[PDB]
Ligand binder design. Structure first.
Ligand code: CLA
Ligand code: CLA
Ligand code: CLA
Ligand code: CLA
Ligand code: CLA
Ligand code: CLA
Ligand code: CLA
Ligand code: CLA
Ligand SMILES: CC(=CC=C/C(C)=C/C=C/C=C(C)/C=C/C=C(C)/C=C/C1=C(C)CCCC1(C)C)/C=C/C1=C(C)CCCC1(C)C
Ligand SMILES: CC(=CC=C/C(C)=C/C=C/C=C(C)\C=C\C=C(C)\C=C\C1=C(C)CCCC1(C)C)/C=C/C1=C(C)CCCC1(C)C
Ligand code: SF4
Ligand code: SF4
Ligand code: SF4
Lengths: 75, 42, 154, 76, 81, 31, 132, 65, 733
């Protein structure tokens, strides 16, 4: 699953989740609940950092599981 | 030593002594009643 | 009673689940603990999912085919507190998560330079605005909609 | 030469004419791999080599079998 | 447009503000009153590529430019070669 | 080497006889 | 920075917004700098423009690996010990199918703990201690 | 000091980051003359690393008042 | 350095390759590219899609033309027992001699591939039968699909007007259409089914000769004009029928009577025609609703204008929504898209449980690769709908000309709109996902009990107030009687809408906790999908990060780094981003039917029951169970049954994967090594002088967000394509 969450971090823009993070920030202000600590989207390359790292800890333990499950028990 | 109108600070993740624990006491209610799925009352 | 079947008072399919399945649990004619003091399938893990006999309480609890129990909660025949009882509970708990969200927050933006007091925490959990939540009788259910957060501030 | 190689197979084994795949047996290779360097590794305890029954790594071409009495281990 | 991205602002002062950007921007063209009195948005832009290094620094307070030029030479992308 | 207007000629001609008879056949030897 | 540099305070820097390039984390609030701080936490274009220290940090904050690899291994030797199966497995190899870890039967858990050899409930191993 | 110089002003342009929000001011222009006077200032930053901008009275809608 | 591409100009002398690609994908963007005028444009879309209708008949022609000489029909109309129909003759020189192996399918000679399109049960289901009697198809349709081009030109030629202003009426047209068109388009169909087809169905033939001599009855249109209609519906059909051959036929067109049959499911002969008729008044009554010169009816403003229901005294305008939906042409093409989008699924979700064809489900394949090419599309629309109503806001739209006015306010009060949308998703998010891991942590853990599993109450509910006469149950006022209807009974709801539980094909399948999830996870799709489209749209105009985001709105993909860091923040790249969830809903949904159906056929249903209430299992039995057939079909042991499919299915997994480049690559890295890789040639012999005419470059910074996609998609959509088929065909079901 985690792998199939990477693509979202890998495949997407950036002033996007901004443009989104405000709609949010708006609804936030009405109740009086947001501004302090200017909430901000991911640092273009952070975004790539949260690709990749996930794509691997996803796509990898997948087999770490796939494996231990076909040598324990016959094999 | 703490009276009235807010107090002293605390760290970055005292949340890691708040996820772990508090919450942790709750397994502690999830074995006292080792089970749920509705619940009797008091 | 409703779409699935009846509770525990009878539920054939459910019974078979009790029994095979768990009890095979068994499955290990022995496997050595004749007197031995660790390997605890033996005691409970079964018996704690098991002595859960023809009793589980009794809960009504509808149980469809394969007799895994389904949750209606439409407030009738028996099933009311499978959502509301643990529903208002979810409400009351949250909301006293964020009543204090809108609190160890609306207590700061003032005095002198208040620009991230929040990456550290002034009163931990707030431990001051704390009980404001159980010390909500009525509360936001009036003073939210009248004054303070008043349409003004809207 | 390094992937569409496989894709041949599909396209032509799903087309289906094995005559012409790349099988360990259709495209010309004939019931032996052997003559390279593996076969001059398990067999080298007869050079400047002193020796000592078997090889260096039991997985090599030449000689021996008998490895283990529960399950298996390594062989050629 | 063919190089049309607006970095304008209001100060168009350029001290500890902005300089960066290969050739394109020979400004300081003082308009009859705008504080440190040097203004506008460019000089003759038919020369270089498509940065937004253009802001990154010294205000545009609105947008900031980027690629928008379309009609796009080559000299206008490194690669005509 | 009379190339003075051609190629359209050799791409109906040559390529209708690398494909006309080239596909057809009087008794399969099938796919 | 600027704070007290001097010569004139053992008094440690706990309190006063920021540090890490110089119109730094600014008074003015933001979030980006909280992934900043962890990221690039180790780096060297900042800390000082002068080698010196850095090799004086890396030979230290190195160290705490060995020590760790060392707190680790312990909980593995302990583990590969009193959460036994090693005694049991050795008189009895070809036969066993080893364990070191075991749950505690809280909530669902236990299914994870399933007869492994010298007569006990646990979760197996593919990390060849029991064999060093 | 006698009228009002720079004591509380909203912004109303819709481009300007803290637009509808009211922060604080400073040395608002004196003379008859130009069109971009008034500095304003507030806590909250904006999309650039530094944000402390100058808008101008054709507008500042403050509005009441 | 020459001049080329004949419409644009910036593009035209661009020395690279962009020259090409970007040529072949600005073509259809008439509004604003060199060659254009509001007069040009319109007409330049008019004799365009007269180039439409045109290409739809060279499709349909051939559909009816690989069928008439081979591709069984004077077979499959002898009795259509579920064994392998036919499309056309597969002919590839690459084929092995296992040309002989199935692939080569029974009746016909050389190999072939069989109708999974429905056509074969509707070229049949409106009669159309005999293999001497049949071989028309192209012949007409094509002596049609050429006319389709002729206006194209005729109406392109100035003189006999191509018409310019006349393109912004409405009233006249649509005062014309939803009568002239639809109404009579119905009617005329009502015509055909009934004179030539209903007879061809229950009854007997119609001979190409007579058309007067044939008379559904003895004494003609009898009364009919004599307001006396009723006595159509008495002994209409029967049931001891033998479909197509009378005998228990009877002959009284129209009904609502009888119903289902083990010998054909499918809507009754008649009913699809009184209906076709019945609606054909309403639209004709509807058509004639607006002006068109004579001086009756309506002006399409003045009933907007100050119409307004809750307006009136709530300070919220309504100004010329007409001269903005009319002066827009995009508002146009996206109120167009949707309606079609919403109904493309209403088509295709009703086309099951109510298929109207002679042998269909109880076919159960064609029935399952046909709900979806109508679920794909349909989803595929919707997006484009939502995507031309974020172009209206930029190229067209006009804040000074729309304001206080309710299209505004929609803009104005927008920040909420995405939020009270996003609040749906985030809720609809983790709450579906508690229920499904929990449901999967509990199995595996040994405890099938403890499983969280809500009955779908308000579902089944809708149906115990219908016909789901499942194991009794009162309901306060209903009981299962005392009050029934009282006001209704033996008219209307006869045998029909009385399928009940019918474990085989009951219409309504009997819903439990397995369905109270997917059904909340198709709901987390169109919501999320649309917070992004709503958003995508609700400011192609601009916002805080990019305030002045316009004069080009749509695809300006990218912007400079700095400000916060700015990216896929063109309303296109949110469309771009949208199309992944339209490709994830339109999958949860389709995925669902089938598993269900599958199981609900050559076997159980308990299967989907306790094994769709969780997640792993959705992968194991379905996904993992039921592929079997296909893949051991290239098998180390020769090409068996299917081979097209599995090779497609891996063609499926490649086209997909190979999306990713495009997608995790981003022009920068590509261009640069092409900078080194175009130092080769220039520097290498036997490949010098040799000039390109287009300068080697790497793909545009919007282009590859597309291409990975338009790539992600086929792969993906070409994998289920071959997946379902490759397993609804075998079965077991
Ligand atoms: C993007 C793709 C596209 C494609 C490729 C297809 C393909 C198909 N669709 Mg389809 N469809 C689509 C989009 C598409 N559809 C959309 C967007 C909708 C929603 C509007 C539908 C709604 C739909 C329905 C409801 C059905 C199909 C069916 C079909 C299949 C029938 C073959 C056919 O269409 O011949 C098309 C035939 C024609 C174009 C000629 C007939 C048109 C008649 C009505 C013209 C009447 C004009 C007449 C001359 C006026 C008379 C006036 C005077 C004589 C009185 C075929 C698989 C059918 C099916 O179920 O197959 C099993 C049917 O169920 N589709
Ligand atoms: C049913 C109709 C409908 C109509 C009448 C139009 C009409 C128009 N659209 Mg449009 N559109 C639609 C549905 C429609 N659209 C839908 C459903 C979507 C997404 C669901 C879009 C998404 C879209 C975008 C992004 C744009 C348009 C644009 C346009 C305008 C220019 C067309 C163009 O760029 O094509 C030219 C394209 C080509 C000549 C071919 C290249 C297309 C590629 C992507 C191939 C697509 C996949 C393909 C089938 C896979 C290859 C096949 C494989 C078997 C090998 C024109 C006004 C453009 C515009 O003007 O907006 C400002 C543009 O932005 N549309
Ligand atoms: C399987 C996928 C993965 C996941 C988990 C998500 C999840 C989400 N996407 Mg997303 N996406 C993905 C792949 C994924 N996406 C891909 C491949 C693409 C295209 C390339 C997209 C394109 C896309 C768009 C355009 C949007 C989203 C949005 C969203 C959010 C919608 C709200 C929602 O569904 O409930 C909330 C989320 C979930 C149910 C997922 C789980 C999140 C929680 C429960 C984390 C678990 C906490 C855990 C215990 C702690 C672990 C962390 C650490 C301490 C170890 C959600 C966060 C939208 C959005 O922003 O909503 C406001 C919208 O912007 N996505
Ligand atoms: C399945 C994959 C798809 C394919 C086919 C490729 C192929 C390639 N990638 Mg790549 N890539 C992909 C997905 C893919 N990538 C993804 C998803 C990512 C990131 C998520 C990347 C990230 C990446 C990077 C960073 C790099 C590449 C590079 C390359 C090239 C390496 C050299 C090579 O062997 O190419 C040629 C061989 C193939 C593409 C495989 C064979 C294709 C078969 C099907 C034969 C078809 C030919 C035949 C004549 C078809 C014509 C018939 C007619 C009908 C058209 C190659 C073009 C690198 C490069 O360019 O170095 C040389 C570069 O380093 N890729
Ligand atoms: C194997 C790993 C490991 C090791 C050996 C270290 C070691 C170190 N980290 Mg470090 N770090 C790590 C993983 C590790 N980190 C990870 C995963 C992160 C997340 C990004 C960080 C984020 C981080 C930051 C922000 C900082 C450090 C710093 C440091 C150094 C400060 C030592 C100190 O001040 O008192 C030691 C104090 C104790 C033992 C008290 C008990 C505290 C608990 C956690 C035990 C030390 C060299 C500081 C630095 O720059 O020094 C180089 C700095 O402030 N780290
Ligand atoms: C490398 C490992 C690291 C890890 C991941 C673990 C992990 C674990 N230890 Mg462990 N342990 C470690 C180092 C580690 N230990 C070290 C260095 C020591 C020496 C103090 C111990 C001494 C220790 C004891 C005595 C116990 C554990 C137990 C456990 C289990 C529960 C531990 C826990 O924190 O909550 C739980 C868990 C598998 C518990 C166990 O053995 O039964 C499950 C038991 O409590 N550990
Ligand atoms: C998002 C929500 C969702 C919800 C509503 C629940 C609800 C529940 N889970 Mg649960 N669970 C979830 C997601 C959820 N889970 C997920 C995602 C996982 C995987 C990480 C689990 C893994 C899990 C386990 C292992 C267990 C539960 C158990 C439970 C029950 C115990 C609560 C309790 O002890 O109350 C008591 C106190 C009050 C009511 C006050 C309760 C019915 C426990 C159970 O006994 O089975 C049902 C069992 O421990 N859950
Ligand atoms: C989903 C709902 C809604 C819709 C679109 C309809 C539609 C219809 N109802 Mg109906 N109905 C509804 C809710 C609805 N009902 C409710 C809530 C009740 C309970 C009071 C009824 C009780 C009812 C009765 C008694 C009858 C209808 C009948 C009808 C049909 C013909 C009405 C007519 O003759 O003019 C029509 C299809 C009539 C019918 O044609 O059914 C056989 C008649 O029987 N309805
Ligand atoms: C009638 C109905 C309905 C509905 C519902 C509905 C009625 C729905 C709707 C839908 C629609 C849609 C969903 C659309 C969408 C679209 C849009 C929203 C658009 C947008 C846009 C943009 C983006 C911007 C501008 C442009 C445009 C506009 C395009 C129903 C009825 C019924 C029922 C059911 C119950 C019973 C009875 C009956 C009677 C049977
Ligand atoms: C939904 C969830 C979860 C999920 C989850 C999932 C669904 C998944 C996850 C995953 C994770 C992971 C995955 C991590 C990890 C890990 C590890 C430990 C790893 C390891 C390894 C290594 C060592 C390397 C590589 C390989 C491997 C991977 C094996 C949750 C939810 C929730 C809620 C309701 C609310 C509150 C909170 C919570 C309670 C939280
Ligand atoms: S805003 Fe930029 S370049 Fe513009 S005037 Fe200032 S610094 Fe000059
Ligand atoms: S921003 Fe534009 S004009 Fe300025 S330097 Fe960059 S490319 Fe040149
Ligand atoms: S893509 Fe890269 S470069 Fe382009 S805009 Fe985004 S960040 Fe900038």
């Amino acid at each position: 699953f985690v792998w199939a969450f990477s693509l979202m971090f890998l495949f997407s823009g950036r002033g996007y989740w901004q443009e989104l993070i405000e709609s949010i920030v708006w609804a936030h202000n009405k109740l009086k609940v947001a501004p302090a600590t200017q909430p901000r989207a991911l640092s273009i390359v952070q975004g790539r950092a949260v690709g990749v790292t996930h794509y691997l800890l996803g796509g990898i333990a997948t087999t770490w599981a796939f494996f231990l499950a076909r040598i324990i028990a016959v094999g | 030593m703490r009276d009235f109108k807010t107090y002293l600070s605390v760290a970055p993740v005292l949340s890691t002594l708040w996820f772990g624990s508090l919450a942790g006491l709750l397994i502690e209610i999830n074995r006292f009643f080792p089970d749920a799925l509705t619940f009797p009352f008091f | 009673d409703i779409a699935g079947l009846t509770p525990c008072k009878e539920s054939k399919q459910f019974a078979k689940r009790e029994k095979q399945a768990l009890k095979k649990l068994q499955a290990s004619l022995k496997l050595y603990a004749d007197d031995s003091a660790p390997a605890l399938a033996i005691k409970a893990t079964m018996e704690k999912t098991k002595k859960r006999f023809d009793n589980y309480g009794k809960y009504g609890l509808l149980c469809g085919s394969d007799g895994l129990p389904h949750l209606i909660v439409s407030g009738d025949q028996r099933h009311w507190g499978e959502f509301i009882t643990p529903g208002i509970l979810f409400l009351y708990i949250a909301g006293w998560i964020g009543w204090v969200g809108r609190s160890y927050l609306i207590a700061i933006r003032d005095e002198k330079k208040p620009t991230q007091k929040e990456i550290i925490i002034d009163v931990p959990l707030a431990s001051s605005l704390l009980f404001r939540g159980f010390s909500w009788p009525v509360a936001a259910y009036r003073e939210l909609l009248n004054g303070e957060l008043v349409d003004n501030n809207f | 030469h390094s992937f569409g190689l496989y894709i041949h197979n599909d396209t032509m084994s799903a087309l289906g004419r094995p005559q012409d795949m790349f099988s360990d047996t259709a495209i010309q290779l004939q019931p032996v791999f052997a003559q390279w360097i593996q076969n001059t590794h398990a067999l080298a305890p007869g050079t400047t080599a002193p020796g000592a029954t078997a090889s260096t790594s039991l997985t090599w071409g030449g000689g021996d079998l008998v490895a283990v009495g529960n399950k298996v281990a390594l062989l050629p | 447009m063919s190089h049309s991205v607006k970095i304008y602002d209001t100060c168009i002062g350029c001290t500890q503000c902005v300089r960066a950007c290969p050739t394109d921007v020979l400004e300081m063209i003082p308009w009859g009153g705008c504080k440190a009195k040097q203004i506008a948005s460019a000089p003759r832009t038919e020369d270089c590529v498509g940065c937004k290094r253009c802001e990154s620094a010294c205000p545009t307070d609105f947008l900031s430019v980027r690629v928008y030029l379309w009609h796009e030479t080559t000299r206008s992308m490194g690669l005509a070669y | 080497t009379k190339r003075g207007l051609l190629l359209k000629f050799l791409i109906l001609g040559g390529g209708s006889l690398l494909t006309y008879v080239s596909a057809n056949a009087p008794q399969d030897v099938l796919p | 920075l600027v704070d007290r540099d001097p010569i004139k305070t053992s008094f440690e820097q706990w309190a006063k917004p920021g540090h890490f390039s110089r119109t730094i984390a600014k008074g003015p609030d933001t979030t980006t700098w909280i992934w900043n701080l962890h990221a690039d936490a180790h780096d060297f274009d900042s800390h000082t423009s002068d080698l010196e220290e850095i090799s004086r940090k890396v030979f230290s904050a190195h160290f705490g690996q060995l020590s760790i690899i060392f707190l680790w291994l312990s909980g593995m030797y302990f583990h590969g010990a009193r959460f036994s199966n090693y005694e049991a497995w050795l008189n009895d190899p070809t036969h066993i199918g080893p364990s070191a870890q075991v749950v505690w039967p809280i909530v669902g858990q236990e299914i994870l703990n399933g007869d492994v050899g010298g007569g006990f409930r646990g979760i197996q191993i593919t990390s060849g201690f029991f064999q060093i | 000091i006698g009228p009002k110089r720079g004591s509380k002003v909203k912004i109303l342009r819709r481009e300007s980051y803290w637009f509808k929000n009211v922060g604080s001011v400073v040395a608002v222009d004196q003379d008859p003359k130009t069109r971009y006077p008034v500095v304003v200032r507030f806590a909250k930053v904006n999309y650039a690393n530094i944000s402390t901008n100058n808008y101008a009275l054709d507008e500042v809608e403050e509005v009441a008042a | 350095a020459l001049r080329i591409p004949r419409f644009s100009q910036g593009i035209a002398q661009d020395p690279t390759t962009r020259r090409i690609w970007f040529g072949i994908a600005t073509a259809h963007d008439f509004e604003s590219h060199d060659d254009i005028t509001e007069g040009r444009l319109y007409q330049n879309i008019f004799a365009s899609h007269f180039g439409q209708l045109a290409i739809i008949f060279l499709w349909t022609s051939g559909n009816l033309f690989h069928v008439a000489w081979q591709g069984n029909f004077e077979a499959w109309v002898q009795d259509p027992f579920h064994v392998r129909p036919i499309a056309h003759a597969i002919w590839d020189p690459h084929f092995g001699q296992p040309a002989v192996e199935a692939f080569t399918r029974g009746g016909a000679l050389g190999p072939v591939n069989n109708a999974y399109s429905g056509v074969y049960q509707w070229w049949y289901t409106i009669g159309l039968r005999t293999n001497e009697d049949l071989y028309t198809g192209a012949i007409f349709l094509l002596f049609l699909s050429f006319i389709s081009l002729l206006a194209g030109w005729l109406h392109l030629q100035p003189k006999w007007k191509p018409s310019v202003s006349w393109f912004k009426n409405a009233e006249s047209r649509l005062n014309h259409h939803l009568s002239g068109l639809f109404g009579v388009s119905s009617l005329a169909w009502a015509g055909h089914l009934v004179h030539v087809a209903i007879p061809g169905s229950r009854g007997e033939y119609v001979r190409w000769n007579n058309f007067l001599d044939v008379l559904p009855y003895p004494q003609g249109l009898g009364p009919l004009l004599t307001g006396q209609w009723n006595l159509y519906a008495q002994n209409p059909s029967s049931s001891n029928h033998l479909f197509g051959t009378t005998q228990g036929a009877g002959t009284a067109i129209l009904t609502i009577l009888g119903g289902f049959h083990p010998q054909t499911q499918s809507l009754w002969l008649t009913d699809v025609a009184h209906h076709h008729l019945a609606i054909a008044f309403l639209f004709l009554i509807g058509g004639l609703m607006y002006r068109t010169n004579f001086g009756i009816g309506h002006s399409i403003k003045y009933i907007l204008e100050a119409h307004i229901p809750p307006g009136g005294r709530l300070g919220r305008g309504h100004k010329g929504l007409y001269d903005t939906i009319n002066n827009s042409i995009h508002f146009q093409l996206g109120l167009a898209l949707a309606s079609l989008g919403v109904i493309t699924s209403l088509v295709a979700q009703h086309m099951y449980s109510l298929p109207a064809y002679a042998f269909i489900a109880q076919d159960f394949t064609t029935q399952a690769a046909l709900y979806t090419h109508h679920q794909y599309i349909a989803g595929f629309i919707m997006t484009g709908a939502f995507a031309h109503g974020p172009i209206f806001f930029i190229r067209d739209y006009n804040p000074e000309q729309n304001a206080d006015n309710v299209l505004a306010r929609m803009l104005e009060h927008k920040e909420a709109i995405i939020s009270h949308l996003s609040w749906a998703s985030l809720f609809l998010g983790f709450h579906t996902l508690g229920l499904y891991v929990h449901n999967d942590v509990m199995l595996a853990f040994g405890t099938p009990e403890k499983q969280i599993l809500i009955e779908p109450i308000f579902a089944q509910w809708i149906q115990s107030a219908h016909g789901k006469t499942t194991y009794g149950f009162d309901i306060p006022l209903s009981s299962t009687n005392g009050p029934a209807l009282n006001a209704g009974r033996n008219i209307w709801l006869p045998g029909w809408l009385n399928a009940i539980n019918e474990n085989s094909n009951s219409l309504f399948l009997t819903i439990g906790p397995g369905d109270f999830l997917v059904h909340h996870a198709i709901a987390l799709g169109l919501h999320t999908t649309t917070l992004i489209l709503v958003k995508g749209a609700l400011d192609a105009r601009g916002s805080k990060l990019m305030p002045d985001k316009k004069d080009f709105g749509y695809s300006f993909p990218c912007d400079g780094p700095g400000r916060g860091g700015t990216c896929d923040i063109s309303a296109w790249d949110d469309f771009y981003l949208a199309v992944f969830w339209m490709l994830n809903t339109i999958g949860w949904v389709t995925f669902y039917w089938h598993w269900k159906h599958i199981t609900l056929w050559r076997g159980n249903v308990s299967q989907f029951n306790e094994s769709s209430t969780y997640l792993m299992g959705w992968l194991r039995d379905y996904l993992w169970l039921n592929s079997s057939q296909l893949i051991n079909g290239i098998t180390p042991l020769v090409c068996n049954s299917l081979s097209v499919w599995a090779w497609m299915f891996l063609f499926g997994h490649l086209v997909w994967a190979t999306g990713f480049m495009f997608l995790i690559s981003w022009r920068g890295y590509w261009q640069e090594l092409i900078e080194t890789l175009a130092w080769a040639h220039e520097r290498t012999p036997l490949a010098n002088l040799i000039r390109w005419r287009d300068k080697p470059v790497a793909l545009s910074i919007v282009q590859a967000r597309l291409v990975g996609l338009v790539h992600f998609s086929v792969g993906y959509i070409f994998t289920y394509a071959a997946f379902l088929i490759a397993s609804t065909s075998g079965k077991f079901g």
